[PDB]
Amino acid sequence: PEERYKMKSKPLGICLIIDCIGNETELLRDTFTSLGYEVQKFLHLSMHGISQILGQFACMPEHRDYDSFVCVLVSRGGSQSVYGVDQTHSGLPLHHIRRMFMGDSCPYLAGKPKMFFIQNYVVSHREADFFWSLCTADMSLLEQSHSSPSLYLQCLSQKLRQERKRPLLDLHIELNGYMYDWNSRVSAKEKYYVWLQHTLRKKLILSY
Amino acid sequence: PEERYKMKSKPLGICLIIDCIGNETELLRDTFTSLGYEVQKFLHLSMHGISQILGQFACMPEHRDYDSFVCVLVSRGGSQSVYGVDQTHSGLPLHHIRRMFMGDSCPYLAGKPKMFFIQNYVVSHREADFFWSLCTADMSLLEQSHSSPSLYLQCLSQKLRQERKRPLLDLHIELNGYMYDWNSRVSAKEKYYVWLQHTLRKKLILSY
Structure with a gap:
């Protein structure tokens, strides 16, 4: 009875990684490569790039x-937008990003899980089958150490790599709990806020 | 290892039902009573009520x-607000509602799952442990038959009552799929749009 997204292709899909900061640390490149995705990573991109x-x-x-698609984006930005490496105050809207992968503009992924994991650093029907995880953190963290991976990316890598058989949603719940616990022990500027929005229609597990 | 919200009290909690339209049809009163909640239902309330x-x-x-709290609200409203039985264009903001049950204003439910299931009809840290399911439908449905329960309420009742052992989140995914399938077969005005937002930190199952 319980429906589950088909996950059998080799590779499971393409995993696009855009790290405009330099702290992704191969954490998700290694994680998704290990899950069976073909990873393509890019660095130092402007909004236009x-x-x-x-x-x-x-x-x-x-x-x-392929049976699915994964996109990881690490960038400075505003709420709901990313600047890439641009010095700007009007960034590339996040909704414009997901818009590019909707069924009408992207038929080849129609009916397939499209997962977005975004680490943003900020200054203090056609829409079914999307998974949108957005972590926002204070820009001051980059001034301190722009090469240190956020805890969100580290936890995400740990969960997916160590528990690939559990549904993505359940792993994300544990990540929520993990981030809440971290937040309760540190100063405002070291906190990570995680927002999750999805339109999944079936159980999603990143493995066979 | 996998954390799960404690669900053992008798009753599991209070289930507050506010039906300002008259079509809840005891579907959720019966469902939650069957799951072990103490249900209190109210009718014909204004925003002030x-x-x-x-x-x-x-x-x-x-x-x-108690180990949890459930609130079901059925009302005409605007986006993100409910009018109760008032003829108005500025309703009671939904965020003002959830605000009343946050840890600071509601210590007794701190660390406990607070579930909100809302059927709205429209014209065409302190925040952890919240589950917010909002269904929006066209006001024309009420002109046609204000006593007929929305499919969202019917499906929700069916899932919780027939599969109380599966996590709430997994049932809601199936409900998503169920609503998408319905929407694909009918005219714009008969559609139901479901928005889900939550801050759960553990697996949530409405039974022992």
Whole structure:
């Protein structure tokens, strides 16, 4: 009875990683490579560079042969937007990003789980099958150490790599609990806020 | 290892039902009574009546002895607000509702799952442990038949009553799929849009 997203293709799908800060530390490259994804990572992209690359990945016909898609984005930004490496106050809207992968603009992934994991650093029907995890943290953390991976990326890597058989949603609940516990022990500026929004229609497990 | 919210008290908690339309049809009263909740239902409340009652339920000291809280609200409203039976265009903000049950204003439910299931009809740290399911539907459905329960309430009742051992989140995923399938077969005005937002930190199952 219980429906589950088909997850059998080899690779499971493409995992697009855009790290505009430099602290992703291969954590998710290694994690998703280990889960069976084909990872392509890019560094030092401006907003225009981000759109160029996102546009190209949304158009690949090889998605047709894959069961899912993963996108990891690490960037400075505002609420609901990313700046890439640009010094700006009007960033690339996040909704414009997910918009590029909706069924109409991206037929090849129609009916397939499209997962977005975003680490943002800020200054203090066609929409079914999307998984959108957004972590916001204070920009001061980058001034202190821009090469140190956020706890969100570390925890995400740990959970997916160590418990790939549990549903993604259940792992994310534990990540929620993990971030809440961290937040309760540190100063305001060291905290991580995690927002999750999804339109999944079936149980999603990143493995066979 | 896997954490799960404590669910053993008798009753599991209070289930507050506010039906300002008249179509709840005892579906959730029966469902939650069957799961072990003490149900209290109110009808024909204005925005002021809704706040009066919500305020009283947020203050009950008996929550101290319960493991959770459930609130079902059925009302005409705007986006993110409910009018109760008032003819108005500025309703009671939904965020003002959840605000009344946060840890600071509601210590007795601190660390406990607070579940809100809302059916709205519209014209075309302190925040951990909240589960917020909001269904929006077109007001024209009430003109046609204000006593007919929405499919959202019917499906919710069916899932919880027939599969009380599965986590609430997994049931809600199936409800998502159920609503998407319904939406794909009918006209715009008969559709139901479901928005889910939560801050759960552990697996939530409404039974022992």
